[PDB]
Protein backbone atom coordinates (compact mmCIF):
# COMPACT_ATOMS: atom_id res chain seq x y z
CA UNK A 1 0.00 0.00 0.00
CA UNK A 2 1.59 3.49 -0.53
CA UNK A 3 4.84 3.97 1.14
CA UNK A 4 5.76 7.75 1.23
CA UNK A 5 9.26 9.05 2.25
CA UNK A 6 10.99 12.38 2.87
CA UNK A 7 14.35 14.08 2.27
CA UNK A 8 15.74 15.69 4.26
CA UNK A 9 15.11 13.96 7.56
CA UNK A 10 16.47 17.12 9.05
CA UNK A 11 17.41 20.55 7.94
CA UNK A 12 19.30 23.49 9.37
CA UNK A 13 18.42 26.81 7.86
CA UNK A 14 18.44 30.41 8.80
CA UNK A 15 15.67 33.00 8.36
CA UNK A 16 15.66 34.09 4.81
CA UNK A 17 16.67 30.98 2.96
CA UNK A 18 14.44 29.26 0.52
CA UNK A 19 14.45 25.57 1.55
CA UNK A 20 12.77 22.71 -0.29
CA UNK A 21 11.53 19.40 1.22
CA UNK A 22 10.76 16.32 -0.91
CA UNK A 23 8.02 13.67 -0.67
CA UNK A 24 8.21 10.52 -2.84
CA UNK A 25 5.25 8.08 -2.92
CA UNK A 26 5.88 4.48 -4.33
CA UNK A 27 2.80 4.34 -6.70
CA UNK A 28 1.24 7.25 -8.60
CA UNK A 29 -0.63 9.38 -6.17
CA UNK A 30 -1.43 12.01 -8.95
CA UNK A 31 -2.34 15.31 -7.27
CA UNK A 32 -3.63 13.73 -4.04
CA UNK A 33 -0.93 14.96 -1.70
CA UNK A 34 -1.21 17.53 1.12
CA UNK A 35 1.35 19.08 3.67
CA UNK A 36 1.15 19.91 7.42
CA UNK A 37 3.21 22.10 9.65
CA UNK A 38 3.55 20.92 13.28
CA UNK A 39 5.42 22.56 16.24
CA UNK A 40 5.84 20.24 19.36
CA UNK A 41 2.78 20.52 21.54
CA UNK A 42 0.44 21.89 18.82
CA UNK A 43 -1.97 20.32 16.40
CA UNK A 44 -1.05 19.66 12.69
CA UNK A 45 -1.84 22.67 10.47
CA UNK A 46 -2.70 22.02 6.66
CA UNK A 47 -0.43 24.26 4.55
CA UNK A 48 -0.96 22.88 0.85
CA UNK A 49 -3.38 20.30 -0.70
CA UNK A 50 -4.14 19.11 -4.27
CA UNK A 51 -0.33 19.38 -4.59
CA UNK A 52 -0.46 23.19 -5.14
CA UNK A 53 -3.57 24.81 -3.48
CA UNK A 54 -2.81 26.62 -0.24
CA UNK A 55 -5.47 26.87 2.39
CA UNK A 56 -6.96 30.29 3.27
CA UNK A 57 -4.54 32.38 5.35
CA UNK A 58 -1.40 30.37 4.66
CA UNK A 59 1.25 33.01 3.77
CA UNK A 60 2.11 33.12 0.07
CA UNK A 61 5.76 32.13 0.80
CA UNK A 62 4.95 28.38 1.01
CA UNK A 63 4.29 26.64 -2.32
CA UNK A 64 3.99 23.16 -3.76
CA UNK A 65 4.38 21.44 -6.98
CA UNK A 66 4.72 17.94 -7.99
CA UNK A 67 3.40 15.45 -10.24
CA UNK A 68 2.18 12.03 -9.28
CA UNK A 69 5.33 10.36 -7.79
CA UNK A 70 7.53 13.29 -6.64
CA UNK A 71 6.22 16.25 -4.69
CA UNK A 72 8.12 19.21 -3.21
CA UNK A 73 7.34 22.08 -0.66
CA UNK A 74 9.21 25.35 -0.84
CA UNK A 75 9.30 28.25 1.65
CA UNK A 76 10.79 31.30 -0.16
CA UNK A 77 11.62 33.30 2.97
CA UNK A 78 12.15 31.32 6.17
CA UNK A 79 10.80 33.60 8.95
CA UNK A 80 11.64 32.51 12.55
CA UNK A 81 8.26 30.87 12.90
CA UNK A 82 8.44 28.17 10.22
CA UNK A 83 11.01 26.03 12.09
CA UNK A 84 8.88 22.99 12.73
CA UNK A 85 8.24 19.56 11.19
CA UNK A 86 6.43 19.22 7.97
CA UNK A 87 4.70 15.99 6.92
CA UNK A 88 3.08 15.11 3.59
CA UNK A 89 -0.01 12.74 3.38
CA UNK A 90 -1.35 11.00 0.26
CA UNK A 91 -5.11 10.57 -0.25
CA UNK A 92 -5.54 7.34 -2.01
CA UNK A 93 -4.76 5.58 1.34
CA UNK A 94 -4.03 8.26 3.93
CA UNK A 95 -0.39 7.29 4.84
CA UNK A 96 1.64 10.32 5.93
CA UNK A 97 5.27 10.61 5.00
CA UNK A 98 7.92 10.46 7.79
CA UNK A 99 8.35 14.22 8.47
CA UNK A 100 11.18 16.73 8.08
CA UNK A 101 12.29 18.73 11.11
CA UNK A 102 13.86 22.13 10.27
CA UNK A 103 16.10 23.68 13.00
CA UNK A 104 17.91 27.06 13.21
CA UNK A 105 21.44 26.90 11.72
CA UNK A 106 24.12 28.34 14.03
CA UNK A 107 27.93 28.11 14.58
CA UNK A 108 29.42 24.90 16.10
CA UNK A 109 29.74 24.97 19.79
CA UNK A 110 31.38 21.91 21.38
CA UNK A 111 29.52 20.75 24.55
CA UNK A 112 30.77 20.93 28.10
CA UNK A 113 30.74 17.46 29.68
CA UNK A 114 29.85 17.22 33.43
CA UNK A 115 29.56 13.83 35.16
CA UNK A 116 27.72 12.87 38.33
CA UNK A 117 28.33 9.82 40.55
CA UNK A 118 25.55 7.92 42.47
CA UNK A 119 24.42 9.68 45.58
CA UNK A 120 24.89 7.51 48.62
CA UNK A 121 21.12 8.21 49.27
CA UNK A 122 20.27 6.48 46.02
CA UNK A 123 22.70 3.67 46.78
CA UNK A 124 20.81 2.69 50.00
CA UNK A 125 17.95 1.89 47.62
CA UNK A 126 20.27 -0.65 46.06
CA UNK A 127 20.90 0.86 42.64
CA UNK A 128 23.18 3.38 41.09
CA UNK A 129 22.72 5.88 38.37
CA UNK A 130 25.72 7.62 36.76
CA UNK A 131 24.59 10.74 34.81
CA UNK A 132 26.76 12.45 32.16
CA UNK A 133 25.63 15.84 30.92
CA UNK A 134 26.88 17.25 27.58
CA UNK A 135 25.87 20.93 28.07
CA UNK A 136 25.12 23.45 25.25
CA UNK A 137 26.22 22.49 21.75
CA UNK A 138 25.55 22.67 18.03
CA UNK A 139 25.13 20.53 15.82
CA UNK A 140 22.74 17.94 17.26
CA UNK A 141 24.96 15.03 16.29
CA UNK A 142 27.25 14.25 19.14
CA UNK A 143 27.75 10.65 20.52
CA UNK A 144 28.38 9.40 24.22
CA UNK A 145 29.97 6.08 25.17
CA UNK A 146 30.32 4.61 28.55
CA UNK A 147 33.31 2.63 29.96
CA UNK A 148 33.44 0.89 33.39
CA UNK A 149 36.92 -0.41 34.11
CA UNK A 150 40.01 -0.58 31.78
CA UNK A 151 37.49 -0.48 29.00
CA UNK A 152 34.36 -2.73 29.69
CA UNK A 153 32.42 -0.74 27.03
CA UNK A 154 28.80 -0.63 28.35
CA UNK A 155 25.55 -1.23 26.19
CA UNK A 156 22.47 -0.26 28.50
CA UNK A 157 22.01 3.52 28.73
CA UNK A 158 19.29 6.07 27.77
CA UNK A 159 20.05 9.51 26.29
CA UNK A 160 17.50 12.32 26.19
CA UNK A 161 17.77 15.67 24.30
CA UNK A 162 16.29 19.07 24.99
CA UNK A 163 14.75 21.13 22.20
CA UNK A 164 16.78 23.77 20.42
CA UNK A 165 17.11 26.66 22.94
CA UNK A 166 15.35 29.89 22.07
CA UNK A 167 18.12 32.36 22.83
CA UNK A 168 21.40 30.57 21.96
CA UNK A 169 20.01 27.70 19.88
CA UNK A 170 22.24 25.01 21.19
CA UNK A 171 20.99 21.55 22.49
CA UNK A 172 21.99 19.71 25.75
CA UNK A 173 21.98 15.99 26.40
CA UNK A 174 21.90 13.41 29.31
CA UNK A 175 22.95 9.77 29.42
CA UNK A 176 22.06 7.80 32.56
CA UNK A 177 23.89 4.48 33.16
CA UNK A 178 22.11 2.32 35.65
CA UNK A 179 23.67 -0.47 37.59
CA UNK A 180 22.42 -2.25 40.64
CA UNK A 181 24.35 -1.56 43.85
CA UNK A 182 26.06 -4.97 43.49
CA UNK A 183 27.69 -4.58 40.01
CA UNK A 184 28.35 -0.78 40.81
CA UNK A 185 30.69 -1.52 43.71
CA UNK A 186 32.21 -4.42 41.65
CA UNK A 187 33.98 -1.76 39.38
CA UNK A 188 36.11 1.48 39.83
CA UNK A 189 36.78 3.91 36.97
CA UNK A 190 33.44 5.05 35.33
CA UNK A 191 33.88 7.16 32.14
CA UNK A 192 31.68 9.25 29.89
CA UNK A 193 33.33 9.74 26.50
CA UNK A 194 31.98 12.50 24.35
CA UNK A 195 32.49 12.91 20.58
CA UNK A 196 31.04 15.91 18.77
CA UNK A 197 32.45 17.58 15.56
CA UNK A 198 33.47 20.80 17.38
CA UNK A 199 35.96 18.85 19.58
CA UNK A 200 39.30 17.69 18.05
CA UNK A 201 39.77 14.66 20.37
CA UNK A 202 36.92 12.90 22.36
CA UNK A 203 36.61 14.09 26.01
CA UNK A 204 36.40 11.41 28.69
CA UNK A 205 35.08 12.64 32.12
CA UNK A 206 35.71 9.94 34.76
CA UNK A 207 35.69 9.20 38.46
CA UNK A 208 36.70 6.39 40.79
CA UNK A 209 34.62 4.56 43.30
CA UNK A 210 34.60 5.75 46.91
CA UNK A 211 37.29 8.32 46.78
CA UNK A 212 35.17 11.02 45.05
Amino acid sequence: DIQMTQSPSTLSASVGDRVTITCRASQSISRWLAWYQQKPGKVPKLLIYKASSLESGVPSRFSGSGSGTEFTLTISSLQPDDFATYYCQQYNSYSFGPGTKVDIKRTVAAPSVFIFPPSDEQLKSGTASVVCLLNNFYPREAKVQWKVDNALQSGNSQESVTEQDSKDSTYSLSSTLTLSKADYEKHKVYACEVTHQGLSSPVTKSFNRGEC
Binding site: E55, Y91, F96, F114, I115, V131, L133, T176
Partner: protein
Protein backbone atom coordinates in the same frame (compact mmCIF):
# COMPACT_ATOMS: atom_id res chain seq x y z
CA UNK B 1 -16.44 28.40 16.01
CA UNK B 2 -16.41 24.71 14.64
CA UNK B 3 -15.08 22.29 17.14
CA UNK B 4 -14.09 18.68 17.40
CA UNK B 5 -13.40 17.69 21.03
CA UNK B 6 -12.67 14.11 22.07
CA UNK B 7 -12.97 12.05 25.29
CA UNK B 8 -12.41 8.48 26.42
CA UNK B 9 -8.61 8.59 26.79
CA UNK B 10 -6.80 7.42 29.90
CA UNK B 11 -4.69 4.64 31.34
CA UNK B 12 -5.36 1.07 30.38
CA UNK B 13 -3.58 -2.24 30.79
CA UNK B 14 -2.27 -4.03 27.70
CA UNK B 15 -4.64 -6.63 26.17
CA UNK B 16 -7.77 -4.74 27.36
CA UNK B 17 -10.13 -2.24 25.55
CA UNK B 18 -11.19 1.50 25.36
CA UNK B 19 -14.00 3.18 23.40
CA UNK B 20 -13.13 6.74 22.27
CA UNK B 21 -15.70 9.57 21.66
CA UNK B 22 -15.34 12.65 19.53
CA UNK B 23 -18.21 15.18 19.35
CA UNK B 24 -18.14 17.69 16.62
CA UNK B 25 -20.09 20.89 16.20
CA UNK B 26 -20.41 23.93 14.06
CA UNK B 27 -20.66 22.31 10.67
CA UNK B 28 -23.22 20.03 8.94
CA UNK B 29 -21.75 16.81 10.32
CA UNK B 30 -23.71 14.68 7.80
CA UNK B 31 -21.68 15.57 4.84
CA UNK B 32 -18.11 14.90 5.82
CA UNK B 33 -15.98 11.89 6.02
CA UNK B 34 -14.54 11.90 9.55
CA UNK B 35 -11.20 10.17 10.49
CA UNK B 36 -8.86 9.48 13.49
CA UNK B 37 -5.08 10.09 13.35
CA UNK B 38 -2.96 9.17 16.38
CA UNK B 39 0.54 10.36 17.22
CA UNK B 40 2.91 8.44 19.50
CA UNK B 41 5.11 10.53 21.93
CA UNK B 42 8.23 11.72 20.03
CA UNK B 43 7.05 9.87 16.89
CA UNK B 44 4.97 11.24 13.99
CA UNK B 45 1.46 11.03 12.68
CA UNK B 46 -0.13 7.69 11.86
CA UNK B 47 -3.55 7.59 10.25
CA UNK B 48 -5.78 5.09 12.11
CA UNK B 49 -9.28 5.17 10.60
CA UNK B 50 -11.93 6.97 8.59
CA UNK B 51 -15.66 6.65 7.64
CA UNK B 52 -18.01 8.04 4.85
CA UNK B 53 -20.80 10.57 5.38
CA UNK B 54 -23.33 7.73 5.63
CA UNK B 55 -20.94 5.03 6.83
CA UNK B 56 -20.87 3.12 3.34
CA UNK B 57 -16.96 2.98 2.97
CA UNK B 58 -14.72 2.43 6.09
CA UNK B 59 -10.92 1.78 6.32
CA UNK B 60 -8.27 0.97 8.88
CA UNK B 61 -4.64 1.48 9.12
CA UNK B 62 -3.19 -1.85 8.16
CA UNK B 63 -1.78 -2.33 11.70
CA UNK B 64 -5.17 -2.16 13.33
CA UNK B 65 -7.72 -4.27 11.41
CA UNK B 66 -9.47 -6.65 13.74
CA UNK B 67 -9.18 -4.57 16.85
CA UNK B 68 -10.41 -1.10 16.31
CA UNK B 69 -13.91 -0.42 14.99
CA UNK B 70 -14.94 3.03 13.75
CA UNK B 71 -18.61 3.94 13.71
CA UNK B 72 -20.42 7.18 13.29
CA UNK B 73 -23.81 8.26 14.60
CA UNK B 74 -25.02 11.28 12.67
CA UNK B 75 -28.03 12.19 14.94
CA UNK B 76 -25.93 12.77 18.02
CA UNK B 77 -23.14 14.29 15.84
CA UNK B 78 -20.28 12.16 17.18
CA UNK B 79 -17.62 9.76 15.85
CA UNK B 80 -16.44 6.93 18.17
CA UNK B 81 -13.53 4.44 17.95
CA UNK B 82 -13.75 1.11 19.86
CA UNK B 83 -10.34 -0.16 20.61
CA UNK B 84 -9.55 -3.68 21.63
CA UNK B 85 -6.71 -6.02 22.60
CA UNK B 86 -4.71 -2.93 23.30
CA UNK B 87 -0.96 -3.47 23.02
CA UNK B 88 1.87 -1.06 23.87
CA UNK B 89 2.18 0.21 20.38
CA UNK B 90 -1.19 1.92 20.63
CA UNK B 91 0.07 4.40 23.23
CA UNK B 92 -0.38 7.83 21.73
CA UNK B 93 -2.42 11.05 21.43
CA UNK B 94 -5.59 10.39 19.29
CA UNK B 95 -6.99 13.13 17.16
CA UNK B 96 -10.44 13.52 15.72
CA UNK B 97 -10.20 14.88 12.10
CA UNK B 98 -12.58 16.16 9.42
CA UNK B 99 -12.13 15.52 5.76
CA UNK B 100 -12.36 18.39 3.18
CA UNK B 101 -13.76 15.50 1.39
CA UNK B 102 -15.51 17.75 -1.00
CA UNK B 103 -14.12 16.99 -4.27
CA UNK B 104 -15.25 15.00 -7.51
CA UNK B 105 -13.62 14.02 -10.82
CA UNK B 106 -13.74 10.13 -11.42
CA UNK B 107 -14.74 9.78 -7.73
CA UNK B 108 -15.72 12.28 -5.01
CA UNK B 109 -12.51 12.90 -2.96
CA UNK B 110 -11.37 13.62 0.58
CA UNK B 111 -8.53 15.86 -0.44
CA UNK B 112 -7.46 17.28 2.96
CA UNK B 113 -7.90 16.89 6.84
CA UNK B 114 -8.57 20.46 7.70
CA UNK B 115 -10.14 20.71 11.06
CA UNK B 116 -8.41 18.75 13.68
CA UNK B 117 -9.08 18.04 17.35
CA UNK B 118 -6.78 18.52 20.33
CA UNK B 119 -6.27 14.99 21.45
CA UNK B 120 -6.97 12.39 24.10
CA UNK B 121 -4.05 10.45 25.48
CA UNK B 122 -4.37 6.65 25.60
CA UNK B 123 -1.58 5.21 27.90
CA UNK B 124 -1.35 1.39 27.80
CA UNK B 125 0.69 0.13 30.71
CA UNK B 126 0.62 -2.30 33.51
CA UNK B 127 2.32 0.02 35.99
CA UNK B 128 0.65 1.48 39.06
CA UNK B 129 0.84 5.09 40.00
CA UNK B 130 3.99 5.79 41.89
CA UNK B 131 5.54 9.07 42.94
CA UNK B 132 9.26 9.79 42.32
CA UNK B 133 12.36 9.33 44.35
CA UNK B 134 14.36 12.59 44.08
CA UNK B 135 18.10 12.42 44.31
CA UNK B 136 20.72 15.16 43.98
CA UNK B 137 23.17 15.37 41.12
CA UNK B 138 25.48 17.44 43.31
CA UNK B 139 27.19 20.58 42.07
CA UNK B 140 30.53 20.09 40.94
CA UNK B 141 32.05 17.83 38.54
CA UNK B 142 35.51 19.41 39.27
CA UNK B 143 34.06 21.32 42.19
CA UNK B 144 33.30 23.78 39.42
CA UNK B 145 34.22 22.25 35.99
CA UNK B 146 34.51 23.86 32.60
CA UNK B 147 33.27 26.93 34.40
CA UNK B 148 29.82 27.26 35.51
CA UNK B 149 29.17 24.40 37.69
CA UNK B 150 26.56 21.87 36.77
CA UNK B 151 24.15 20.82 39.53
CA UNK B 152 20.65 19.15 39.36
CA UNK B 153 17.93 16.73 40.44
CA UNK B 154 17.13 13.17 39.31
CA UNK B 155 13.39 12.55 39.57
CA UNK B 156 13.13 8.80 39.41
CA UNK B 157 10.50 6.00 39.37
CA UNK B 158 7.11 7.33 38.91
CA UNK B 159 4.03 6.69 36.80
CA UNK B 160 2.28 8.31 35.02
CA UNK B 161 3.60 11.43 33.25
CA UNK B 162 3.83 14.39 33.91
CA UNK B 163 5.82 15.68 36.85
CA UNK B 164 6.71 19.36 37.09
CA UNK B 165 10.18 20.52 38.31
CA UNK B 166 11.19 24.14 38.98
CA UNK B 167 14.25 25.49 40.73
CA UNK B 168 14.17 27.77 43.75
CA UNK B 169 10.49 27.90 44.32
CA UNK B 170 9.97 29.33 40.79
CA UNK B 171 12.49 32.19 40.76
CA UNK B 172 15.61 30.30 39.30
CA UNK B 173 14.97 30.14 35.57
CA UNK B 174 18.23 30.66 33.69
CA UNK B 175 20.46 27.87 32.74
CA UNK B 176 17.74 25.52 33.84
CA UNK B 177 17.29 22.72 31.26
CA UNK B 178 14.80 19.96 32.00
CA UNK B 179 15.18 17.00 29.84
CA UNK B 180 12.39 14.98 28.33
CA UNK B 181 11.26 12.13 30.51
CA UNK B 182 12.50 8.64 29.42
CA UNK B 183 10.48 5.48 29.98
CA UNK B 184 12.56 2.67 31.44
CA UNK B 185 13.37 -0.96 30.69
CA UNK B 186 10.37 -2.19 32.49
CA UNK B 187 8.13 0.40 33.99
CA UNK B 188 8.36 3.71 35.43
CA UNK B 189 9.89 7.02 34.21
CA UNK B 190 13.10 8.90 34.92
CA UNK B 191 13.85 12.65 34.38
CA UNK B 192 16.60 15.19 35.39
CA UNK B 193 16.41 19.00 35.65
CA UNK B 194 19.92 20.57 35.76
CA UNK B 195 21.58 24.02 36.20
CA UNK B 196 24.95 25.62 35.65
CA UNK B 197 25.52 28.26 38.27
CA UNK B 198 28.66 30.41 38.50
CA UNK B 199 31.01 28.27 40.45
CA UNK B 200 31.93 31.42 42.35
CA UNK B 201 28.69 31.78 43.89
CA UNK B 202 27.92 28.06 44.85
CA UNK B 203 29.01 28.31 48.44
CA UNK B 204 26.85 31.34 48.99
CA UNK B 205 23.54 30.18 47.47
CA UNK B 206 20.80 27.65 48.07
CA UNK B 207 19.53 25.49 45.22
CA UNK B 208 16.23 23.84 45.80
CA UNK B 209 14.29 21.78 43.27
CA UNK B 210 10.58 21.60 43.51
CA UNK B 211 9.08 18.48 41.87
CA UNK B 212 5.35 18.01 42.11
CA UNK B 213 3.94 14.73 40.85
CA UNK B 214 0.29 15.35 40.85
CA UNK B 215 -1.05 11.86 39.79
CA UNK B 216 0.26 10.69 43.25
CA UNK B 217 -0.10 13.92 45.35
CA UNK B 218 3.67 14.28 45.84
CA UNK B 219 5.43 17.55 46.47
CA UNK B 220 9.16 17.08 47.42
CA UNK B 221 11.64 19.97 47.68
CA UNK B 222 15.21 18.56 47.76
CA UNK B 223 17.93 21.15 48.55
CA UNK B 224 20.93 20.17 46.39
CA UNK B 225 24.33 20.75 48.05
CA UNK B 226 27.80 19.64 47.06
CA UNK B 227 29.78 16.70 48.20
CA UNK B 228 33.62 17.52 48.06
CA UNK B 229 35.33 16.71 44.88
Amino acid sequence: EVQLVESGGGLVQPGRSLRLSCAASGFTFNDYAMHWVRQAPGKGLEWVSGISWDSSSIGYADSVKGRFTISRDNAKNSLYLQMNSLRAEDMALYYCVKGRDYYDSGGYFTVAFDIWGQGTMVTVSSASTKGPSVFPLAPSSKSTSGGTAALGCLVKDYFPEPVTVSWNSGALTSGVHTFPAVLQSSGLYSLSSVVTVPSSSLGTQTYICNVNHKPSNTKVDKKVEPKSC
